[PDB]
Ligand binder design. Structure first.
Ligand SMILES: CCCCCCCCCCCCCC(=O)SCCNC(=O)CCNC(=O)[C@H](O)C(C)(C)COP(=O)(O)OP(=O)(O)OC[C@H]1O[C@@H](n2cnc3c(N)ncnc32)[C@H](O)[C@@H]1OP(=O)(O)O
Ligand SMILES: Cc1nc(NC(=O)c2cccc3c2C(=O)N(c2ccc4ccccc4c2N2CCCNCC2)C3)sc1C
Ligand SMILES: [Cl-]
Ligand SMILES: [Cl-]
Ligand SMILES: [Cl-]
Ligand SMILES: [Cl-]
Length: 427
């Protein structure tokens, strides 16, 4: 069946017949976009969600909405239970705008029935760099589904983002909407066998028991790598350089292009000037084993994202004798509710974030990270096949998950690429 909203938006459609590998914006309309607030059905209202005071009623309403109505696995066995501390870390980022956190409320009862958010980030896409957005936590109350409310919330957040002179966005989905520029596969490393076995996540193969299963999913500790410790704020500048060196090494453009990236923020104000971001690629094979699109981090961003908050985010670095940082691993933590058992204990899952292995192999780095995940009472460690993570997944004890993660970019052209070419991690 055909789209009724997405067929009208500047994104590559599923039937695109482009005969060329091209990068660049799809449309350049700095002045023609709608600026008036969108209208909601009678008895509903917009509000800027107050996630700036963790004790606010807005925060309680948002937490409850997402706990009961946000993302479930494709088999409706588990639902995400984002904590307030996680949402604050994930949405109150540097440069965030108070009106990029959009809620929908029933006027008569003050019940919050909808939500959508965006955060600002910096990205490199091939030979361009820009300030862009990431849309996440789109949620509509279950009883209001299939009433064309989601396009309204999308149009609304788009208006608010464009009013900040930002005209692209990145967003992920478990299903196919339009054409995604890549599809990521996630994998599970079992840590707490007993918990996951009783939660219904894993079974028992023939001729095995929980004991032999615990023994098999054991995390090895016979070749530890010394020098890893939690990051602190004073590591920020060196973690910033560690990422820059990492993205410089895996770049998919020449050294000359990397030093003269096209700053789209300076040419998106004009239709003629913005076309300088058009870039044709003659050989898609030139991107093999390289990163084509990735987030960029300054020191203020590093301080926020690559910190340590109990039950939210974990970041470790490896040092040498001189206190210089040479490796980094990180994962964030989200609780998952068991849908058919409201009394089941807490299930905490770890999610691979950004990881840089220079003084050890990536498999060696992930083992240290798995040990640290065990120390943080995480029942499983989830990883996507992004960047170089395939090195850890192949010939391992990782188990394939049931779904796949589609990656989209709003108002930008990206040819279909491998997930290994992508350095973008959504929350
Ligand atoms: C420059 C700035 C631009 C900023 C904007 C950038 C783009 C951001 C876009 C948002 C990305 C968010 C990123 C995340 O957080 S991804 C996860 C989103 N949240 C959930 O999955 C939680 C559980 N489910 C729900 O909350 C609702 O089912 C939602 C709200 C998802 C849809 O509500 P409902 O189920 O009641 O449907 P409808 O009748 O209102 O409307 C039908 C239309 O909605 C399109 N649809 C359905 N699901 C998604 C989806 N996950 N991404 C994009 N579009 C989606 C669908 O194609 C159809 O369009 P078309 O097929 O007719 O065309
Ligand atoms: C061990 C265990 N894993 C479960 N996963 C689910 O239920 C589930 C259901 C639907 C969709 C998803 C999941 C799930 O894990 N995804 C997943 C998997 C690996 C990631 C690696 C890095 C970053 C994110 C990752 C990520 N996200 C989830 C957070 C939100 N950002 C989108 C992508 C998507 S339940 C359970 C008991
Ligand atoms: Cl619609
Ligand atoms: Cl797809
Ligand atoms: Cl040590
Ligand atoms: Cl600190």
């Amino acid at each position: 069946k055909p789209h009724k909203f997405w067929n009208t938006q500047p994104v590559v459609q599923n039937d695109d017949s482009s005969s060329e590998y091209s990068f660049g914006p799809i449309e350049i309309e700095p002045d023609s976009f709608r600026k008036e607030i969108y209208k909601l059905p009678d008895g509903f209202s917009w509000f800027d969600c107050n996630l700036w005071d963790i004790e606010s009623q807005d925060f309680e309403d948002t937490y409850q909405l997402l706990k009961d109505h946000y993302v479930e696995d494709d088999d409706s066995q588990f639902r995400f239970n984002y904590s307030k501390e996680f949402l604050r870390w994930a949405l109150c980022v540097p440069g965030q705008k108070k009106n990029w956190l959009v809620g929908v409320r029933v006027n008569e009862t003050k019940k919050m029935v909808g939500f959508i958010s965006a955060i600002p980030i910096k990205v490199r896409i091939h030979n361009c760099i820009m300030n862009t957005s990431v849309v996440n936590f789109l949620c509509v109350h279950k009883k209001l589904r299939s009433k064309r409310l989601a396009p309204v919330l999308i149009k609304e957040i788009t208006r608010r983002i464009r009013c900040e002179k930002i005209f692209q966005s990145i967003y992920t989905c478990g299903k196919n909407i339009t054409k995604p520029f890549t599809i990521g596969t996630y994998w599970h490393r079992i840590i707490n066998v007993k918990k996951l076995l009783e939660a219904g996540f894993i079974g028992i193969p023939r001729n095995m028991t929980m004991s032999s299963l615990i023994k098999y999913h054991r995390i090895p500790a016979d070749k530890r790598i010394e020098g890893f410790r939690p990051s602190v704020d004073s590591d920020a500048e060196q973690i910033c350089k560690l990422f820059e060196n990492y993205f410089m090494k895996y770049k998919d453009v020449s050294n000359e292009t990397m030093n003269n990236l096209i700053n789209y923020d300076e040419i998106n104000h004009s239709k003629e000037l913005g076309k300088q971001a058009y870039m044709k690629l003659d050989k898609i094979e030139d991107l093999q084993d390289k990163i084509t699109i990735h987030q960029c981090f300054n020191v203020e961003d590093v301080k926020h994202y690559f910190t340590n908050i109990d039950k939210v985010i974990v970041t470790y670095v490896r040092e040498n004798k001189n206190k210089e940082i040479t490796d980094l691993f990180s994962f964030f933590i989200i609780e998952s509710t068991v849908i058919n058992n409201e009394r089941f204990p807490t299930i905490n899952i770890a999610y691979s974030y950004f990881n840089i292995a220079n003084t050890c192999s990536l498999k060696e780095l992930f083992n240290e990270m798995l040990i640290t995940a065990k120390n943080n009472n995480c029942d499983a460690f989830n990883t996507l096949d992004l960047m170089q993570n395939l090195q850890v997944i192949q010939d391992s004890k990782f188990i394939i998950g049931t779904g796949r993660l589609r990656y989209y970019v709003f108002n930008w052209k990206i040819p279909q690429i491998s997930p290994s070419n992508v350095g973008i991690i959504l929350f």
